[PDB]
Design a protein around this ligand. Sequence first.
Ligand SMILES: O=P(O)(O)O[C@H]1[C@@H](OP(=O)(O)O)[C@@H](OP(=O)(O)O)[C@@H](OP(=O)(O)O)[C@@H](OP(=O)(O)O)[C@H]1OP(=O)(O)O
Lengths: 46, 101, 272, 442, 223, 852
Amino acid sequence: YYRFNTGPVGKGPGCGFWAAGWRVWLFFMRGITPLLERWLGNLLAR
Amino acid sequence: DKSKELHAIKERYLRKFVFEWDASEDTSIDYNPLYKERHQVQLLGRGFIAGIDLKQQKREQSRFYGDLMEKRRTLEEKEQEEARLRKLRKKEAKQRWDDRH
Amino acid sequence: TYQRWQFTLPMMSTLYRLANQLLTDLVDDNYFYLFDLKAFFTSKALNMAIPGGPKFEPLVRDINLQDEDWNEFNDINKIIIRQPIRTEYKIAFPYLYNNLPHHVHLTWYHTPNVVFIKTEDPDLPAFYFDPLINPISHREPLPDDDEEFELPEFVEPFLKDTPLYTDNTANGIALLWAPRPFNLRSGRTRRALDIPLVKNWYREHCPAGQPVKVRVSYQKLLKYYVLNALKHRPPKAQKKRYLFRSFKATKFFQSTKLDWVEVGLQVCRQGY
Amino acid sequence: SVLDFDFEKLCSISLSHINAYACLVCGKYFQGRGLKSHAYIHSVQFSHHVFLNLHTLKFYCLPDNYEIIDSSLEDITYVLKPTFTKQQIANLDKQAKLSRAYDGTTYLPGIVGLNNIKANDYANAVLQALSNVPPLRNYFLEEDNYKNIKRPPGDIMFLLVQRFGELMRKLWNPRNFKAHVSPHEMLQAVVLCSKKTFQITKQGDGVDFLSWFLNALHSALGGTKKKKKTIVTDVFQGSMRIFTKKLPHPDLPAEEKEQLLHNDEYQETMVESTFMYLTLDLPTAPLYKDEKEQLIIPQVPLFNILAKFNGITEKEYKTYKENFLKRFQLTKLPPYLIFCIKRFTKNNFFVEKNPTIVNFPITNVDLREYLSEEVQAVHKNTTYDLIANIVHDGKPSEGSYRIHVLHHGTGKWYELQDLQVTDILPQMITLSEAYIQIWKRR
Amino acid sequence: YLTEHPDPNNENIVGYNNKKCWPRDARMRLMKHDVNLGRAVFWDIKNRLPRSVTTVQWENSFVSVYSKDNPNLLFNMCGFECRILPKCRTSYEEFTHKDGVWNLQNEVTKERTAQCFLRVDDESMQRFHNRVRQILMASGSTTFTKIVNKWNTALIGLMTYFREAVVNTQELLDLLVKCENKIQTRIKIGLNSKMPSRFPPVVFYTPKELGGLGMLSMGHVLI
Amino acid sequence: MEQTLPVTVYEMDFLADLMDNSELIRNVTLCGHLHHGKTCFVDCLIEQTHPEIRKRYDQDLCYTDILFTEQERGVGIKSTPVTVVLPDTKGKSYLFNIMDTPGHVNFSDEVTAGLRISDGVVLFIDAAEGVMLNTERLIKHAVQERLAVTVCINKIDRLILELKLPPTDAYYKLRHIVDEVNGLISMYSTDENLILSPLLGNVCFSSSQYSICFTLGSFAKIYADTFGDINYQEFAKRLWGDIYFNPKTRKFTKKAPTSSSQRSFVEFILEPLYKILAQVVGDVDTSLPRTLDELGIHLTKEELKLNIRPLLRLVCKKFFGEFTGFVDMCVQHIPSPKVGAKPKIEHTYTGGVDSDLGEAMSDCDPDGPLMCHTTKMYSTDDGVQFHAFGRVLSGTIHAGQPVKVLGENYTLEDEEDSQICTVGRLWISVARYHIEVNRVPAGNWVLIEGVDQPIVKTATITEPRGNEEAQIFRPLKFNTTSVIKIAVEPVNPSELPKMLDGLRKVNKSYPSLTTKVEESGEHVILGTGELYLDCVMHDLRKMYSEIDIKVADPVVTFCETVVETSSLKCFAETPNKKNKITMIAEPLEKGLAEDIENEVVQITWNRKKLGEFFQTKYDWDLLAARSIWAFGPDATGPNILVDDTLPSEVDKALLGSVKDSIVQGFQWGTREGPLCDELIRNVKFKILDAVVAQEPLHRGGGQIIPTARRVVYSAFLMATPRLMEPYYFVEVQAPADCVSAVYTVLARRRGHVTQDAPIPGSPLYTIKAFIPAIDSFGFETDLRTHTQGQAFSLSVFHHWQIVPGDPLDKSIVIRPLEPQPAPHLAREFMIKTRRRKGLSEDVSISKFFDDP
RNA sequence: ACUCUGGUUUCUCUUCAGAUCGCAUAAAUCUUUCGCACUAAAGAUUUCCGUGGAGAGGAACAACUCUGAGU
Ligand SMILES: O=P(O)(O)O[C@H]1[C@@H](OP(=O)(O)O)[C@@H](OP(=O)(O)O)[C@@H](OP(=O)(O)O)[C@@H](OP(=O)(O)O)[C@H]1OP(=O)(O)O
């Protein structure tokens, strides 16, 4: 934001740059995928 | 700041889901003038920090190298730069005229 | 498979021009003096924080300076003080300004200043005396001219026909000093996840005029970057088993081609 | 009074081993002898005008720089570099007259206390035990016996040998300036050679240190190769026959248990090897005190712990998921026998020191019954006399080490603990918890 | 001492006991000569005593040297950590009247010559803290009156013994205010499980004859 | 011998055969400024001579700089010797001993160690930065050591790919660099025979990054190979120096035709290089094959797919080939050990060439008396044992041979500093591997083993039972002075001996390091800077002694002086109450101490010439010019001892009996000094009167030496004493904008900026400054951090300047921990140092007198 | 200057892989450390995100540019 909102652009809800957060949440999903899979396998066994 | 400095000399020789960080976690609270106001990079007057608006960077730059060119450039070089700036400003003005509220 | 790419230099020049907003146009690592990964590791191992750098919990237990019992070594009546020994001094020379340098990485010293002169006017010749360059103030056992040295007609300059510069010469010389994704001309495709578009933004120093919250955001981003780079272990050898290939090999799965929005809606419905 | 030659021979100013000169007025080591050396400057500065070359053993007056020739100074050199003639070495053990130090402190050579640098009493006890052993001490009292043996270029183990010999010559010096010897150089060599094991600050096990020291002396005295017969092996090493009998798992049927007896794997084997010391295992503490009037302290005879090596006694040995029955039979008795009584044992939670008292005689022990009949004929002598007894006192953590040494020539027994030398009665030695023992075969 | 116990490495400083309660400039400064002298004095004293009769351990003893290198003379006596600083030695400042400081003067001339800064030994502070802990745990079903009486007796003994040293010792004052807050807390929790925010102090400090607990105070309490 | 060695173009037997012939050996030191490409050049040579060793596409492989600290820092720290066999232009293989020295100024001492055992110097100069501080210092040191000098103008590609200069402007930049080097040489050398110019072949143009190494002869030979009919030597003569080419007449003339044609260098050398580089970097995919075909270079498809930098390196390796220009430059101009032996003996050997053994060594014959001379001490990987590295000047060293090693104090009259040692092994020292050999003939470098015990810094290896008149070589005279003083102690005193051992080892590893113990039992290390001491302490902590070590903050070693004569004639008697000596002290004239230090005057000269010099240059009286006794504490010491005793009052013959004792006392007193036990500098001591006892036993020895020191101290104290701070010279290579900011930094550290001239042909400026050494700690870090890393500075010792305050001012009050103001800084610098040394609290003017 | 291999693309299997296996970066468990552990460090293991190398198999269209060899 503080790089996007320099010059003519001021504070506002118009800044779209979602690479960083999308990366972070995908990296979290990578870590938590095996845990949820193991939980589902335990909960759906037999 | 001097009391911060002398203090520095002495010191060396003697739940809650918090979404936003606390301001006490800040660093770079210096007392040395050489470290508080750090001389930014002027990449020969032609390099700019990423992300920031190019026009803002051009306006707020130190303008040292502009003086250096206006002192060293020959008359022909001055004419060349003036013509290039004329064309670039013409294109920028055309873009601004196209992009109006 | 879209795994390897090779580009011609004009394409890479156009790409570098189109991505100039996301690059700081630095031509050296001298900008990262006492502010790079090794400097951060040295700061962390010494339980000290660089002003622009992050702050960590102590690597080892630290004994209060009021616990030492005034030895002859640390007698303050003998110590001459001229300037306060800053944290930067100790990080720059960890083995000189620290009494217990442990797990400290020696920071890379000065690199030669890249003096690459960036060209602004395309009409100018590629090899041109830019005004940035300081003009050189002009002012030999030469052989006598009367001697009979003759050059055969077969002899001429090695590339006399070759022009000194071409329209896309300054572009290549600029590409020499481009950031890493643009220094190359051939490379290996990366995941969209694996490309941090803004990693170099917080790897550099915070801009001088910024509020307190964004400075702390920069510091914490640096902290997590350092933690990732330090807790990193090389990947362990596997047997290369692919889950989706196994899924396709069974009867329960079938392949097709679908719009991303359609599969998003279908995944939402299946999760519900 | 200030001439202490027990430490490193380096210049106090320049840290240089080259041309180290000891100043005989203040005892400080400086460098050089010429006009612009530290020793010359010190001589003209502090007015000390007498110096001794630490390597040439020659005295000089530096401001005029001329040699000093006087026999009255000879004793000083003898303190710096003690030299034992062969007749002196032979007559060493037959010495009854007390020796006077420079100060009025009579002492018996060999019976000399070792300074306790922080917590190194275990090392002092072990070194005193290895000293007072006639053959090993005689071997190390002559520098020529080990100086000429070859060493590898990047070898540090030999620092253990020479310094140890040096230590001996300091201990058995008939004329010494003080009645005590600093083991600092020897302990520094031990720390350097052991790779930060057996430190001077933190005390270690006497048995472990003795084992490591004997092994290191044996290895270092083998020049650029494994000399099968060193002085350490010639003196302390003996040959013992291990009868290892593998055992079936106890959780098996009796029929399968006897069927495994025909496997030819669970029978006695021939793993005869060489023992440098005998590890005697005390029986466990009796827990509840006996109803008799006797003390709560258990008492076990020496022959009872010396029963695992009789030949028929079968002590169980159980590693992970395997059982054994290690029968032991001595085949060659070394001239000097080493017993390493096992006191400290690690239980499930801490380390317990066994308080069992070993009832042993100190003048006659016959081991003829622990040797095979074909072996008994080889050794004419099996009567052992206890000569050294390392005893550990106190808790396993904050323990202290003392030693009972038998001074030959006389018959007196002396207890040494650091700088404390007491005259112990011969009867009282058996009462203390013996840890390590050195016996002479005669 | 060095003839009998040589120290080529100047290792005599590694185990030297010093009074960590005082600040670094107030403790003993481990000069080489001072450390050697202290070790020599202790060694001579130990040699004067046969070991079987009694033993004088170095770890349980403390030797403090005052010389041209050390201005402070420290000693622990009867629970009091005393530090004498001579007037003509490292004072260079006007002095006011502080409770924890004793103004020592020569009898024959009635001239102030040294200041004896007093403190409470950390051993005594630990004994007081343990006494408070024992009072708290041994409370159980006992009446609040007896708990407050025990706390009052402990406080009276501590203050009547360490009168000036309590004022001098800031760590002790913090310990007393913490223990007082604990005692009141105990009473409060007894009154009710829920934490009584802004509980009235009047119930605690009111004398027993008037119905209160009769609790003495050593902290700053604003009614 | 026979052992495993890496694959190389030549054969080890050929390398051993070249060693026997001393006419085909070149002892070369590659010196220069920091990061000017010396190590990369050596790496290029190694790649040329080792097919299996290849430089990484991304990381510039460094065959030298093998230390872990060198790899991490990226800065060369220790000299690396490399012995190779390099082909010449004609194809004749020469044996090359190259001592890659560090470029950093703090490690200049290392270069000195590489200059004693070398006959030639190759100075590497950046084509962009040009001549820097270390280049000037190394030029002065090399031409003062009587060494042949050649220049390699490295990183010419920066003129093409960084500055993008026009080819004529690049030629102008190179010519300016050459002219500046020539001016420096002429300024530091009276003789004008060694003019450096690429026409003579003294200058080679190189780019070690892209392996572009060529001289005029080599590139003319390239022309000869592509066009056979041309003779390369005459063409190379015509290629440089504003000589234009006429293609109508095919002739070279000093007159420029068409008024637009470029020089021969620009037309034939620079322009083709620009075209090659521009085609590779700009027109690779579209127009690289045509230019590659025109040059005869054929590249595979996999080779053409490389990135631009590897492709440039490959193309220029294929074009220029081997570094034959460097070999020419070092063969034609750098003497062989046979040729260059005589200057080396005349300069370094103490006995001189006139001695019989000097004449023996002048021949450099393998079958002579052994006179090896080692100046380096290389530690093994384990760090326990050291190998003494040096050249063999005469005879032949054999493995397993008894040897007499002479130390720095060995003399004929006093031979005690000599030890008989058995050489263990001999290695020819390549960078990352060592070739074990049975013997090494004269004129070659060798790593002697087993002789490290009796030597700390410098050795003189000779053979025992012979050379009874053999003397030592002069100890290494160092470019700078070690000033930065740090106290070192162990964390746990129980492991004090280990650190002590470590100290010895570092004393062997660093030629200029000085480790001692002061009166207070404080271990003292002297270094040349903060990076130097950082490397020293890293070695002391990790390589030699693995113990934790506490390091005090860095302080400088001050000097002592006087500013005006003694108030009264001071005097002292011996403890015998006889032999009264009466002296006064006065300051020396301006520059006299500099003359003494720089060997402009020597006490070894006869009385006539010394008196004439002191009478003409400084206008001394004839009696005053002939009565001079000694120069300061050491040889050529900054102080002067004179006797003004008229012969009528004092017998000169009697005074000469105690002359040696008085001179010894003078030297000791000047070495120690009474203010804070520091060197007395720039003080003239005059012996006004001297009573001498007639009997020999009541004088001499311990009577007159302490008396002389006492009277020297009294004369120094009564004269107004002052302290000298060491002032460093700092050169900052900073961008044009940052220059102002630089001043700001030097504003806070008492820094005086002398000049801020720009770099011709470069967009940077060289800000020169004179900063106090005591204030220089962290100045480099402060400057680089304040300017975002764009400004870099190198500080080297320059001179001694009087501290503003007055040391003998008891009225000054100094708080224990406060930066004192200037007007009494000396008062702070005297007492605190007095506390660090362990002396008394303060010194009184009448302390050494006799009345009190 | 004339002949003969080695082709490229894609799918799958197996194995090695301390290589920045990855110019990116997660999760869990245990131990340790001082606080009193999302807001914390250290050590270790493991699982996921997905690679490189080699080999084998399948099928798609190219067959002598290059690497060379045989001349
Ligand atoms: O949380 P911050 O980064 O400080 O940003 C918050 C706010 O965020 P919340 O809605 O989460 O409170 C807005 O950010 P967005 O919602 O747009 O992401 C807003 O941003 P805009 O003004 O750009 O719309 C503004 O950020 P800023 O004022 O820094 O631009 C504001 O900050 P404050 O909380 O400091 O007012």
